[PDB]
């Protein structure tokens, strides 16, 4: 199609950045999709898990959308027209883990029209001594 | 109202033994958005050699320690004018009265068995 | 970018406008989004209620649409795409009740890109 | 939206119209609307019902699209756009019931834009 | 494929709706076709007329708008698409006149894929007490 | 329409915002409608004129989009779809006039579905010491 | 309302002098739907050395002897802030006023003059 | 575009077939385009032309959009919207010419989405002794 | 009014165009229907085959979606709406076979109002 | 959001593709945009050129289409939307030139929502065989 590649946009708004620290980290997907109707998914590295106090665009997750062990956020039908859509997943008050760098991923599973279809993004998780 | 049939299909009802069992469950109206939810009772699970509608049940789609299993409604399941669940290969609970139960959440029906005593 | 509005419009379409006279009542709700999917419902006020021979968009309302004593209409999976979707309630032959000013509501609780924000509309009902 | 009703042609085209002789029978329904993403469902009056044998759009209909013991066809995603769809249940080799009217019905029953989701069409079998 | 009607609404807005008091009436037009490019038209049954303090989608009406002595509002390029096009018109602060039911049209008079066929609507104009 | 109203913003992006100084002013409108093929026109008050070395969307001004002495600058074609578009007046290295508070416009005035076609914005020009 | 401007534009402005005119309808409104029409007085004519912004006349936008410029707006051609036909390089007629007319013809006018000096 | 090519039928509506006799001619063309706002042409071959007693889509054509000596008859802004456009040319009571095949032709010459945009057609006009 | 057909290109992309060595090759098709919701389905001629190092629209294959020993790839919910819809499967780093022509086809096997016939598309491999 | 890109493939459609044999090739071309109205143009690399006798989308090109000595062929009043529009031009009956790599251009000049960058496309003409 005529849009772009999909988009994700992954920060740490809590105050914290740093490891074993509580913080807030918000997720932010754009399908970028000329139309989608279908299965939409976040996929967390290991160290970060959704719960029924996460919000997707404000709305508390709902137990059914929580898959893998907290490992998978996923909306089984998913809008998107001419890139208005959009997918912010909250992951709310986390205790950060070791410091490294973690990779978040979204992607549009089935039932959309566009060029590339999934994203990725990454976090810096800070260490206890600088 | 929704309905379900719950059967015995294999060849032995008996308490311990080697069998299988389907539940077809009929909306008779409509779905709306939502996930197709089958409760199992104590005593009977699902494992991913089971299927609905033909196809195998993915690892996502079962918890409650095997009792639940879930079918979110993607748009190409939304219009299905049935969902049938079959427990392949199951050895039989104790003698009684098991009743299985599905609903649309967001549709309910209830059908039972009888287990066979030895 | 920004988004539009609902609208609803409630038109007393019977010859009649009447307090305690019979007359018929048209509910005409666009939810205005650019894609909709799911449940749109349009809510009563006193004095009114929905029946099986209402109808939504021409055609016989279902027992299963009509909830909370009848106040309460439901299309359950409606579309809407660019605003085009439209839904028009038809309250057919209904006593008018008490003169005065009765306000309808239509609501949009589907997945949606779109604002959801309900949108109202009133009818006024002449004395005898 | 900007389409005209939902259309529904019904006609024996099979050599005899008589009853109890063996006919065909062509359900043609036109959704037109603007866009369809749902359930369209064709009703049978009593005296005709469908089986595996008979087809949509070509294709033998499949037993999870025959329900309520053959008096209903279902098209469980029945796409439309802009009025472009079309759905033609043939009801083939068929004994034709006694002499009379029936009335057949077709409608999109979910995820559709348009003014008016159903319409109906009659035959006539003749008598002797 | 047959196509669609267009449809007007035609309201009080105001908080009063009897005769010979200061009212608002809004005019909400949905020519209602697949595509349209031009002229669409309003007009006001006598005992309402148009001015440039009247508005159109929000805009004060220009005074080539206004036509026939107030009686007739013009969008000379209006767009269609998909039924998805609206012009409201506002007729603000206006003196309802005597009591009645008053019918409003409008009229699509575009190049238009689509049914042309007009839109009415009315207001009752009630009794002073 | 499914799309909210035009929107403008105005704002003086060169150093200084002092009347009788060298500055520049950047105007963003958005007309925000499903679609669009007509024109499109910015309004610049007395104060503020346009000229071939001020740009649309980064391209110099054609001498036949600026009418009205330079008070008018045009898009004879402004295409919009879905809101996408988008039309940004530089207003390029301009002496500020008098201090005060100077309001812009920017209309789609033919061919766009929409529920409001208009949007002003303006400046605030501050007083020398 | 509308308006039109006729000026001859070259060295002279004397009867049988080669010369430049411009005639510029401007809109002071936006265009409607229609065609866009210009009438020249008997003494001038419009050939495809002519031009409307800066594009040459097409044979089929020329009538009525070469008295007749005609162009149907397009939809690339209704935004237009002006109408510009230039006549290029012409024989200026007998002295003279001429007045020169312009409008929009729609399904729903503009003069000027110029003189021509004797010599 | 997804849709087919223009199309153009042409046929003698008319009771006489034969040469020089009166009769009455009807040129349906469908764009069949996504999208047309631009400029559509008939074009009409040597033995038949197009006056102000002719209609398009039942309406009398304009002086305006016949040019040519009568051989062109043209639409400046015409619409089409997902193959929903015609154009139905009605040549009323012309004599018809000699003998022969005649063709026709009809196109979108501007602004239009498809994947061609012209169609020809045409009849045959008999002879008065067969 | 009449439908247009699918579209299928093929490409070597990579440096070298000869047989026997690496290479890099993009089919792209567009199904080019107003409509169509369901399976599309790439097939590869003998001398290439797919694995889960390629990709479809830039996201490497799924085991699920590699069929018939590497010579069938399935996009099982493809989404087309007016013609804009698009899939590039790119075949990567591949040994080139034989100097010749070889014919690639996509088709659409999905719920569609558009021509679903397939469309084909080749390249030639060079001699050394 | 982000906007896609435009494309551009050119295949050597005759049934040779040897150097010095007659042959036509296609070149199709997607600007890919939201909204495209104006100008879009064609770019022959030496060794080929354009005439009359080639087409755009199945219609003879018109001289005033075709400019620098045959090198550009421009379609002056082009129309875009959802990335649907399609140009395809065809060079029929060409002498291909020499063995070698030929690469074609194509750009949007127009009035676009959308990612006016060209799309480029090569084909081979083989050498004649021994
Ligand atoms: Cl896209
Ligand atoms: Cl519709
Ligand atoms: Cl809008
Ligand atoms: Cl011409
Ligand atoms: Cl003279
Ligand atoms: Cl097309
Ligand atoms: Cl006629
Ligand atoms: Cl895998
Ligand atoms: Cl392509
Ligand atoms: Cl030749």
Redesign the interface.
């Known amino acids: 199609?005529?849009?772009?590649?999909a988009?994700l946009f992954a920060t740490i708004t809590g105050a914290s950045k740093t490891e074993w620290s509580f913080s807030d980290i918000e997720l932010t997907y754009?399908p970028?999709t000329?139309?989608?109707?279908?299965?939409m998914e976040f996929t967390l590295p290991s160290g970060f898990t959704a719960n029924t106090k996460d919000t997707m665009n404000g709305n508390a997750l709902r137990t059914?959308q929580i898959?893998?062990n907290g490992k998978?956020v996923?909306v089984?039908?998913a809008?998107?027209?001419?890139?208005?859509?959009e997918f912010k997943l909250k992951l709310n008050n986390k205790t950060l883990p070791a410091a490294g760098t973690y990779t978040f991923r979204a992607?549009n599973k089935?039932?959309?029209?566009?060029?590339?279809?999934?994203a990725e993004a990454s976090i810096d998780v800070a260490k206890r001594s600088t």
């Open positions: 199609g005529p849009l772009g590649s988009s754009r970028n000329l139309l989608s109707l279908g299965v059914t898959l893998n998978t996923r089984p039908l809008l998107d027209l001419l890139g208005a859509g992607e089935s039932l959309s029209i566009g060029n590339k279809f999934y």
